[PDB]
Amino acid sequence: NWLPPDWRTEIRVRTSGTKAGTVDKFYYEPITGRKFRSKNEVLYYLEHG
Amino acid sequence: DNWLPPDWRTEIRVRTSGTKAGTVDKFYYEPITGRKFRSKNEVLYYLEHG
């Protein structure tokens, strides 16, 4: 819990290949739908919109 | 997914926020191009027609 109001989250779970079973979390910006790959990439961009 | 050609990648996307929380989508990725498909039939269509 640190995430602005309308922000969508998801996990991608790898189901084939060398990294089958790995879970990656993604954050999407509202209206735009802009994909971020980490906490800090979102924290950073809130500061520098 | 034995039907899939070699070096195709699969994953599931699960929504973790909003109305659609808990929704699971299957994706299929073509080797090298990274091109995205959303079902078995869409992949078999593409392999046939290019």
UniProtKB/Swiss-Prot annotation, chain A:
Main location: nucleus
Lineage: superkingdom: Eukaryota
Keywords: Chromosome, DNA-binding, Nucleus, Transcription, Transcription regulation
Domain MBD, residue spans: 1-49
Compartment(s) where it occurs, according to its Swiss-Prot or TrEMBL record: Nucleus; Chromosome
Tissue and organ distribution: Mostly expressed in flowers, and, to a lower extent, in seedlings, buds, stems and mature seeds, but barely in roots, exclusively in root meristem cells at tips (at protein level).
UniProt keyword Nucleus, yes or no: yes
GO molecular function: enzyme binding; methyl-CpG binding
Gene Ontology annotations for the cellular component aspect, listed alphabetically: heterochromatin; nucleus; perinucleolar chromocenter
Transmembrane feature ranges: none
Function noted in UniProt: Transcriptional regulator that binds CpG islands in promoters where the DNA is methylated at position 5 of cytosine within CpG dinucleotides. In addition, binds specifically methylated m(5)CpNpN but not m(5)CpNpG (N is A, T or C). Plays probably a role in gene silencing.
Domain writeup: The methyl-CpG-binding domain (MBD) functions both in binding to methylated DNA and in protein interactions.
Quaternary structure, from the entry: Homodimer and heterodimer with MBD6. Interacts with DDM1 via its MBD domain.
UniProt-recorded name of the protein: Methyl-CpG-binding domain-containing protein 5
Shown part of the complete sequence: 33 to 81 of 182
